[PDB]
Write a protein that binds this DNA or RNA. Structure first.
Ligand SMILES: O=C(N[C@H](CO)[C@H](O)c1ccc([N+](=O)[O-])cc1)C(Cl)Cl
Ligand SMILES: [K+]
Ligand SMILES: [Mg+2]
Ligand SMILES: [Mg+2]
Ligand SMILES: [Mg+2]
Ligand SMILES: [Mg+2]
Ligand SMILES: [Mg+2]
Ligand SMILES: [Mg+2]
Ligand SMILES: [Mg+2]
Ligand SMILES: [Mg+2]
Ligand SMILES: [Mg+2]
Ligand SMILES: [Mg+2]
Ligand SMILES: [Mg+2]
Ligand SMILES: [Mg+2]
Ligand SMILES: [Mg+2]
Ligand SMILES: [Mg+2]
Ligand SMILES: [Mg+2]
Ligand SMILES: [Mg+2]
Ligand SMILES: [Mg+2]
Ligand SMILES: [Mg+2]
Ligand SMILES: [Zn+2]
Lengths: 136, 128, 176, 125, 37
RNA sequence: UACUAAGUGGAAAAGGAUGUGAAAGUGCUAAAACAGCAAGGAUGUUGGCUUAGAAGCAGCCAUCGUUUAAAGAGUGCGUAA
RNA sequence: ACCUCGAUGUCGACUCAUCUCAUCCUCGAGCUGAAGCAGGUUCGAAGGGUUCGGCUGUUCGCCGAUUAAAGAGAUACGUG
């Protein structure tokens, strides 16, 4: 469960995911990457599910990079609570993924295994994923 | 056709042969008659199982890579290929090749030479 | 390709009358009739001992029709010259069949007696009680008879009991 | 590629030009153990059994200015059995082996700038 | 017969067909029959 | 002038599919292409630890080499093996 | 908090039921770690049926004895 050690403000305004791709747009650490095609809010739980799935289907020498990080938190008012009396308490942390940001990258294991590994990582995420390679 | 495992000094048993119709009791003498030159060593036999009943049999050499262990002066090879423990020269390799030329289907003797290297690589023994 | 495959036939006894929509094939055995659906996108040509089917366009159904009726003409010719046969291995503990007139009766495992009517043009013989041979001049009819005889006792996977086809292997299971 | 095929056709044509005897066989129902056994029983560098392409064999034959062998290499299974100097013992050896086999056909070959028939192969042993 | 929203071959012998404008998977092994692709 | 065969049009997602049309590249092919059919499809050996046992198809020590057109410590099934 | 505070009677029970299928029984079929009997799961199917009691206002619920079965809901949580 990825989580910032401390934050200055407990309850920040939500960060929009509509728009193009700001940073993390091109594979620059590995050479295959899982790009997104639909901006959405994805939480640290989905990262851990996808990262554990990919790691289980990885090998003994493969190496991985995690680009996105859940910096921003989100709140949720408790159930059966009527409107008013202030904002709710922070519940879960979500990373803002825009259309075009490379989320996961893999290297150092043959080609066939990485496509399968990226596939299982993207089936754990709500965004519509697509595979990209690193420019020579 | 059956490749059956029988000890050189003890080959009278074996029920599987009886299923094909082989005359087991008459043929026991033939099995034991031509293996006394290699007593104690385990020698499998190939049997031309068929209905002619004149079952021609051929003996067979003990499996390889046990003489590699004897020549390397070690009982069991390394459990990792990278760690090299045993060393074998060309003279010990060539004695095995001319010994094992009978069972091998190679035309030349250098082909049998590089069989020793081939099985030594599996054992991890350096070819010096 | 099936459409562009030769259909070399000897003129010894097999003739093929091509009407508008009524193909007639006559030979050693009975005559086989094939109906042509209207507006068929494929024209036959009748040279000496060679029939060639050609098409007018590159449509999907045009290609599909060109292949299917070449096979049908091949199948019709083969049945007229030498016929078709199917072999059924009826195997079991008390299973046996025999033929009386036009009805083939079986006693597989059923309290109610089993009778089966034989259609026209097909002859079924029973040399041995465990054996049935269906011989005919139309492939689909003998196939329909074979499968409709089978439907009474489909071969089960635990033992060999059933109306098996010949040289047909079934996956075995061990019901301890 | 084309250059390798050109090199291949040239060398086989040269080999059949400098040779003296040829016989064609089929590859129907004999084991690889048996195939290795035939190699050791010949043991002569003049005698050589080889799988050749049907197309490459005819094209090398055109370059060899020979004739009449075409009927052998048509709709058939083709072997090449080249013999240098003496070929009768090779033919005798292969004839003994096919008798030891289960089934075998045997197609006409070429020797001494002359061609033979199937029965002529029976007496060439 | 197995009804699934997604159908994919299980073993290399499984073959995809289109019957009655519905995609099914047929194979020698009857345990690998899928539908509703 | 093309496209659709779904009444789609005339409501929907993650996911799945030899539906079909267009385009841009690349491999082989009348020195014969692909599928299918007919043949072979190997030897040391069943390598060795290992496992009651595995030895073409348990985990391994790895992931051999020759003959040869081809052949794999095997493609599965399968055999206690 | 959009209709109704110049009035829309709100639980349960009784009577009468009707409709939907995400089917409890009956009907058909595929797979099974389906020998047979009895099962499990999925698919198709709404024509009919779907019990009586003890305690509690009770819906619910537990228990008793049967049944092929004692289905899930909607209809102003149907119906003064
Ligand atoms: O006033 C009545 N019913 C009102 C009409 O405005 C309304 O139907 C109503 C019914 C039930 C209710 N309740 O259960 O609290 C409240 C309002 C009746 Cl008491 Cl006459
Ligand atoms: K009111
Ligand atoms: Mg519509
Ligand atoms: Mg598709
Ligand atoms: Mg397309
Ligand atoms: Mg309010
Ligand atoms: Mg308001
Ligand atoms: Mg109102
Ligand atoms: Mg009023
Ligand atoms: Mg009133
Ligand atoms: Mg239903
Ligand atoms: Mg009715
Ligand atoms: Mg009382
Ligand atoms: Mg309600
Ligand atoms: Mg009410
Ligand atoms: Mg109610
Ligand atoms: Mg309520
Ligand atoms: Mg009323
Ligand atoms: Mg009332
Ligand atoms: Mg009243
Ligand atoms: Zn399958």
């Amino acid at each position: 469960m990825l989580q910032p050690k401390r934050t200055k403000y407990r309850k920040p305004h939500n960060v929009s995911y509509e728009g193009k791709a700001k940073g993390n747009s091109y594979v620059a650490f590995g050479e295959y990457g899982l790009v997104a095609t639909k901006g959405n809010w994805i939480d640290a739980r989905a990262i851990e599910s996808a990262r554990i799935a990919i790691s289980k289907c990885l090998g003994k020498t493969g190496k991985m990079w995690i680009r996105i990080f859940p910096h921003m938190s989100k709140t949720k008012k408790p159930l059966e609570v009527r409107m008013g009396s202030g904002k709710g308490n922070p519940e879960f942390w979500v990373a803002v993924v825009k259309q075009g940001t490379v989320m996961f990258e893999v290297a150092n294991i043959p080609e066939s295994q990485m496509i399968k590994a990226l596939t299982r990582a993207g089936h754990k995420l709500p965004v519509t994923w697509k595979i990209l390679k690193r420019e020579e | 056709i059956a490749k059956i495992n029988l000890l050189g000094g003890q080959a009278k048993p074996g029920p599987a042969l009886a299923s094909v119709g082989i005359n087991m009791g008459e043929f026991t003498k033939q099995f034991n008659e031509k293996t006394k030159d290699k007593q104690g060593e385990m020698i499998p036999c190939v049997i031309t199982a068929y209905n002619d009943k004149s079952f021609d049999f051929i003996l067979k050499t003990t499996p390889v890579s046990i003489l590699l262990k004897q020549a390397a002066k070690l009982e069991k090879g390394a459990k990792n290929a990278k760690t090299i423990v045993g060393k074998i020269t060309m003279a010990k390799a060539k004695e095995i090749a001319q010994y094992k030329l009978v069972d091998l289907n190679a035309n030349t003797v250098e082909a049998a030479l590089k069989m020793v290297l081939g099985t030594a690589k599996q054992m991890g023994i350096e070819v010096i | 390709k099936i459409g562009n495959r030769t259909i070399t036939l000897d003129p010894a006894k097999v003739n093929l009358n091509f009407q508008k929509d009524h193909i007639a094939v006559k030979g050693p055995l009975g005559q086989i009739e094939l109906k042509l659906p209207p507006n068929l996108p494929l024209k036959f040509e009748l040279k000496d001992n060679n029939l060639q089917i050609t098409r007018n366009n590159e449509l999907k159904q045009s290609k599909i029709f060109h292949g299917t009726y070449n096979a049908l003409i091949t199948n019709a010719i083969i049945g007229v010259t030498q016929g078709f046969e199917k072999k059924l291995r009826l195997v079991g503990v008390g299973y046996r069949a025999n033929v009386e007139g036009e009805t083939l009766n079986l006693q597989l495992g059923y309290s109610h007696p089993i009778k089966e009517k034989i259609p026209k043009g097909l002859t079924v013989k029973v040399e041995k009680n465990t054996e049935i041979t269906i011989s005919g001049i139309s492939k689909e009819l003998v196939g329909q008879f074979a499968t409709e005889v089978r439907k009474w006792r489909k071969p089960e996977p635990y033992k060999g009991k059933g109306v098996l086809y010949f040289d047909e292997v079934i996956v075995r299971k061990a019901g301890k | 590629a084309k250059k390798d095929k050109a090199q291949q056709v040239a060398d086989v044509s040269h080999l059949l030009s400098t040779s003296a005897g040829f016989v064609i066989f089929d590859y129907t129902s004999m084991s690889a153990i048996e195939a290795t056994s035939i190699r050791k029983k010949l043991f002569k560098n003049g005698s050589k059994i080889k799988v050749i392409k049907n197309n490459i064999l005819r094209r090398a034959l055109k370059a060899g200015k020979f004739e009449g062998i075409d009927e052998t290499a048509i709709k058939g299974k083709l072997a090449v059995a080249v013999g240098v100097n003496e070929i009768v013992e090779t033919l005798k050896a292969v004839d003994g082996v096919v008798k030891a086999k289960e089934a075998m056909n045997f197609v006409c070959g070429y020797f001494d700038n002359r061609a033979f028939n199937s029965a002529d192969l029976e007496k060439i042993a | 017969m197995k009804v699934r929203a997604s159908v994919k071959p299980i073993c290399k012998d499984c073959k995809i067909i289109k019957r009655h404008q519905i995609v099914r998977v047929i194979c020698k092994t009857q345990k690998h029959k899928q539908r509703q692709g």
